Amino acid sequence: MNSVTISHAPYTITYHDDWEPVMSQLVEFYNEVASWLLRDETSPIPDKFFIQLKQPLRNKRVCVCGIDPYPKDGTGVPFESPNFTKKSIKEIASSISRLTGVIDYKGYNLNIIDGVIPWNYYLSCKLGETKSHAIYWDKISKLLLQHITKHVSVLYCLGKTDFSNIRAKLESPVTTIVGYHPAARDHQFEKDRSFEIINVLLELDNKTPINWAQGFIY
């Protein structure tokens, strides 16, 4: 556990030693963009921006990347807000509950999973519209993805429209599984029937397949 202090609203940053090599860089990359970012109300609080940076990365081998946090109700963990009303958590639960064979789903809580971490291309957004702060972390979205892809062997992303140029965005040709958004990639509903592909690909790398029922809460 390490703590760092900055000159802006977030101040303390929550992260782990696994993310440590880039954190300082992120700090400077957040020094010159926080002034023009905190001026507009955001879905998470400034402290909540760095929340998903503390989970361990060595144990996890598959990373699931989403499109963007929804404009309100910031929580710091993608597709995590338990309400059974918003499409995000319901889709992130039903994309694996039906495949595994379990029913009566109310939330999966990917935080406790030691092999799969949820992710988003953009850290946050503005209260009222999406992708309203993409410029301020356009290179943070590069360095975070570079750091996470160096700790895992399989990368999963949702939505081809916003993830078409991931290969150009990546430097090391690490294996990257491409998938569609559970709600709608582009005016098209996706059931996300590619999790068994992720399991078999992880098995091919001499690694145990992901148990998608370890954190199923019912």
């Binding site: 010159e32 410029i135 301020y136």
Partner: protein, 813 residues
């Protein structure tokens, strides 16, 4: 209505549309809309077996399909290559489809749009008013572009509206940041449709104190607060950053023919748009001429990390998305990718662009004047250097003497410049117009009015440098010629690669010859090596060396040998010597040298020792026809240029011949590209083998010969390495040369297309005369069919250190 085209572009919306930008004689810009299409080719049965009714069907006509799959054979029982003849049709579909047996999947859809409709990208057309439908003022829609372009007229010069802009932004680190640093100055050279070339620099007044702003206003600067107060006839205009960025946005929203900048895509436009979004939350709204769609300034990178050779990797090219039809031209990428330089910096290009030999009038300790009249210089460079010097203030005397111009004046066929340079003994010096060399941070720490004006002058000089390079390289004329030849959009003439460059003329040739090449099996690539430079006989030479080269060696050998994949009868491979000789004795009676030709290629497989490619020279192939047509067209345009007097026609013809030269000197390189439509392993191997054979023949005929009593006796007889000819074979030849001449020829070095021959003669004039006589003899008797050579220069004291590494003195003809 007469329209000359400027650019072609297509929309990126859900309902994709293609647009054409042109201008009339008066200067009114005309935009025309066409429906974007997807082009596919089908046969008779496939067209007749389409359950949905086709949107539009056009009979492509009779065409012959040939399989280009290599069939390696170990004996002379080689089956005939697959070939068929059938009627084909072309179909246009707005949306993407997946149709089986639809060939020609490599040619771009824009190339099909250009070629099927018979439209030249840079042509001037007298459109018909009956087939044109008007949308609104300046923007029309056409449903039948085939009938729209039914008339073409000879080209006429139009004053193109240009924007040559440069932007100097504040910076404390190596590269300025959008979120940290503001825009300081923006210099624009704006050429209207009326020809008024207005130079104006907008400055950010928020970095100057109120007294400084008042003093600048007293000095002539205009201070404004709103966009309605902007005046374009004043060089120095002071305004706030919000006002400056709004003015820049309203300028970039204008329908300019060419917005030309140096490294603008990477730095200038990106910084402008990002600062506009950050400071005010506004976006540069690019609007389509139809006023049906709008976008923002997005810069996307096309990355090409592939060389297919031994060198390193190239760079990526940035492009701006828009629908206003304005070419956001970047000269940096064009210069980098079309010219070799030691350093890819603006200073180097500026230094190597304009040079002038001038005479020192006075010395005055550190006060020298360099008069640049035509007496001390060449012809033509005087006016151009005067135009460059009008907007410049720094001179690179000698090679590193940076000096600042004190006074400026203009003289007829010359110029007047005075510099602070130390006294020198020599009278004539070569001055190169280098970029300004200043320590920006040190002089920015004490920023004031004079420093602001100096930066404004530097910015306007940088902005006008774009116009100077645009005129020097003939980029308008070269771009029009490249659009006409390569069959590509004017913005995509330089942006696209060699494969797309060829795909236009290659498709045109294929349509002319009704030829389709189809490859079914997956292609396999093998190292074909390629090279002949060997160890020189000697490295020390105190005598002159004569240089002789081949004029378009590879195109000519492809034409002569008919080195085409669809003409290749077959390949015979040998593993044992007995079957090799049996096959040789069979092919010398089945494939006679007088009609066919056999080329000894390198074995494609490790087990094989000898591979023989048999080319039938009865039907000319697509590659030889391409090269022959390109050479003929270049020669025709060159001989038309030689009789031209007007500068405009001179530039036009030079650009057209340059484009033909470029498109001719690419087919050999593209024969080694797997994904290209000219891919052929056997043809490339045969081409390099024939080149090596020609180099060997030239070396043999030029080594061991002697000149005595006007008679030349070659060491080896005039024997054709390929087949048997019917002409004189005696190496002894007579020349009209002095009897006292006693010289010996001994070649020591030979490149892929050049051979170095040493001559013991020391006189320059005698060496030049001997080289000319040798060239005439080689072109008259030694060579045959359609082969020629040329004389470039004479090398003196040629000493070789290693392969392709020599030091010598070159004397012009």
């Amino acid at each position: 209505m007469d329209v000359r085209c400027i650019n072609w572009f297509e929309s990126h919306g859900e309902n994709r549309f293609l647009y054409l930008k042109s201008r009339c004689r008066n200067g009114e810009t005309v935009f025309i809309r066409f429906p974007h299409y997807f082009y596919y080719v089908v046969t008779d049965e496939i067209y007749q077996s389409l359950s949905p009714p086709p949107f539009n069907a056009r009979p492509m006509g009779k065409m012959r399909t040939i399989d280009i799959d290599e069939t390696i054979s170990y004996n002379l029982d080689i089956k005939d290559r697959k070939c068929s003849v059938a009627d084909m049709w072309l179909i246009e579909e707005p949306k993407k489809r997946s149709i089986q047996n639809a060939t020609m999947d490599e040619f771009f859809n824009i190339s099909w749009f250009y070629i099927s409709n018979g439209i030249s990208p840079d042509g001037c057309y007298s459109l018909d008013e009956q087939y044109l439908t008007k949308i609104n003022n300046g923007c029309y829609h056409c449903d039948d572009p085939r009938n729209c372009f039914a008339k073409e007229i000879p080209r006429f010069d139009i004053p193109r509206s240009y924007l040559f802009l440069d932007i100097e932004c504040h910076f404390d680190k190596k590269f300025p940041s959008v979120f940290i640093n503001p825009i300081s100055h923006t210099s624009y050279c704006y050429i209207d449709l009326s020809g008024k070339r207005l130079l104006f620099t907008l400055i950010n007044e928020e970095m100057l104190t109120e007294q400084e702003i008042q003093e600048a206003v007293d000095r002539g600067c205009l201070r404004i607060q709103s966009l309605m107060e902007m005046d374009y006839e004043r060089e120095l205009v002071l305004c706030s950053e919000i006002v400056l960025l709004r003015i820049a946005k309203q300028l970039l929203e204008l329908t300019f023919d060419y917005v030309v900048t140096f490294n603008g895509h990477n730095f200038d436009l990106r910084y402008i748009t990002n600062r506009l979004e950050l400071l005010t939350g506004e976006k540069i709204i690019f609007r389509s001429p139809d006023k049906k769609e709008a976008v923002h300034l997005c810069i996307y990178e096309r990355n090409q990390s592939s060389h297919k050779g031994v060198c390193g990797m190239a760079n990526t090219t940035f492009h701006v998305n828009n629908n206003n039809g304005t070419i956001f031209f970047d000269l940096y990428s064009f210069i980098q990718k079309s010219e070799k330089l030691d350093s890819y910096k603006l200073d180097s290009i500026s230094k190597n662009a304009f040079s002038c030999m001038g005479k020192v009038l006075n010395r005055g300790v550190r006060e020298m004047t360099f008069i640049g009249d035509d007496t001390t210089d060449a012809k033509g460079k005087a006016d151009t250097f005067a135009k460059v010097l009008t907007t410049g203030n720094y001179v690179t005397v000698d090679e590193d003497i940076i000096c600042k111009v004190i006074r400026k004046d203009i003289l007829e066929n010359g110029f007047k410049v005075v510099l602070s340079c130390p006294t020198l003994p020599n009278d004539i010096y070569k001055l190169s117009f280098g970029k300004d060399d200043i320590d920006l941070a040190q002089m920015y720490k004490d920023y004031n009015l004079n420093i602001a004006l100096d930066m404004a002058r530097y910015c306007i000089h940088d902005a006008c440098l774009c116009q100077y390079l645009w005129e020097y390289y003939g980029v308008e004329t070269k771009t029009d010629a490249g659009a006409a030849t390569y069959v590509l959009p004017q913005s995509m003439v330089f942006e696209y690669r060699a494969s797309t460059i060829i795909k236009g003329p290659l498709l045109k040739l294929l349509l002319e010859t009704k030829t389709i090449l189809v490859r079914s099996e997956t292609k396999q690539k093998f190292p074909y090596e390629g090279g002949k430079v060997f160890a020189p006989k000697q490295k020390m030479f105190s005598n002159n060396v004569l240089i002789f080269d081949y004029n378009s060696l590879y195109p000519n050998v492809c034409i002569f040998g008919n080195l085409s994949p669809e003409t290749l009868v077959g390949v015979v491979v040998s593993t044992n010597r007995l079957e090799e000789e049996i096959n040789n004795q069979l092919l010398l009676q089945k494939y006679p040298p007088p009609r066919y030709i056999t080329v000894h290629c390198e074995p494609r497989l490790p087990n094989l020792i000898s591979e023989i490619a048999i080319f039938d020279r009865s039907i000319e192939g697509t590659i030889p026809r391409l090269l022959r047509t390109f050479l003929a067209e270049r020669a025709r345009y060159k001989k038309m240029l030689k009789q031209a007097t007007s500068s405009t026609e001179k530039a036009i013809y030079d650009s057209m011949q340059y484009t033909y030269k470029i498109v001719a000197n690419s087919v050999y390189g593209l024969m080694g590209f797997r994904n290209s439509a000219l891919y052929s392993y056997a043809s490339a191997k045969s081409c390099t083998s024939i080149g090596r054979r020609m180099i060997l023949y030239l070396e043999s005929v030029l080594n061991g010969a002697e000149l005595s009593n006007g008679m030349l006796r070659f060491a080896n007889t005039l024997s054709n390495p390929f087949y048997m000819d019917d002409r004189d074979i005696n190496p002894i030849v007579k020349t009209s040369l002095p009897i006292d001449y006693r010289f010996r020829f001994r070649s020591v070095y030979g490149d892929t297309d050049s051979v170095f021959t040493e001559i013991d003669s020391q006189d320059v004039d005698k060496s030049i005369e001997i080289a000319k006589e040798l060239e005439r003899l080689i072109n008259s008797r030694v060579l045959f069919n359609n082969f020629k050579i040329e004389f470039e220069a004479v090398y003196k004291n040629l000493i070789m250190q290693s392969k392709k590494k020599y030091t010598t003195m070159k004397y012009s003809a």
